């Protein structure tokens, strides 16, 4: 629902800034930039919500042809000015009890990661759907740092 909510303003603007992901359409490319500059893109329940939302927007937006996932410039003193892709699950939150089995560990595997493979299942609301019930697009990954 969040992605459907934000789709009109993304088709028009070509830009969405979220807490953990900045999404930009440019030259037909959905540029997802993981932008948790303070923690090297450590993952949590919010990051998955933004990732799934962004991936959906890339897939349902007809002006996007290829996707791109890349880590943004970091602000932490050891990495200031340098991009870092991902440092994995937020271990602090995990210890503190903030990592949900359903809303994180299961949500990410069945949702946006599975949509990277198989695309988004739409309604029967466009031509083709008989052969392509899902909209899928190719994805490029660029790993800076690690």
Q: Any contact of residue 138 with a copy of itself (CB under 8 A)?
A: no
Contacted entry of a copy of itself, ligand YE1, none for residue 63, CB cut-off 5 to 8 Å set by kind: none
Q: Give the binding range for a copy of itself (CB under 8 A) out of 41-49, 74-82, 111-119, 129-137.
A: 74-82
Question: Residue 114 and residue 118: Cα distance in Å, rounded?
Answer: 6
Q: Is the dihedral of CA 117, 119, 121, 124 positive or negative?
A: negative
CA 42 – CA 26 distance, rounded (Å)? 26
In angstroms, rounded to a whole number, what is the distance separating the alpha carbons of residues 143 and 59? 22
Q: Looking at beta carbons only, is 45 or 71 nearer to a copy of itself?
A: 71
Q: Which residues bind ligand YE1 (CB under 6 A)?
A: 39-40, 42-43, 76, 78, 87-92, 105
Annotated binding-site residue numbers for substrate: 37, 43, 76-79, 87-92
């Amino acid at each position: 629902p969040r992605a459907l909510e934000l789709l009109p303003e993304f088709v028009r603007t070509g830009e969405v800034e979220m807490e953990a992901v900045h999404l930009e359409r440019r030259d037909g490319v959905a540029r997802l930039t993981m932008c948790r500059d303070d923690r090297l893109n450590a993952e949590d329940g919010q990051q998955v919500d933004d990732m799934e939302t962004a991936v959906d927007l890339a897939l349902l937006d007809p002006g996007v042809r290829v996707g791109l996932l890349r880590g943004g410039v970091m602000s932490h003193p050891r990495y200031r000015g340098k991009r870092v892709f991902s440092a994995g699950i937020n271990l602090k939150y995990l210890s503190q009890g903030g990592i949900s089995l359903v809303d994180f560990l299961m949500r990410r595997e069945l949702g946006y990661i599975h949509k990277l493979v198989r695309g988004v299942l739409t309604n029967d609301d466009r031509p083709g759907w008989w052969h392509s019930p899902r909209i899928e697009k190719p994805w490029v990954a660029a790993v800076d740092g690690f």
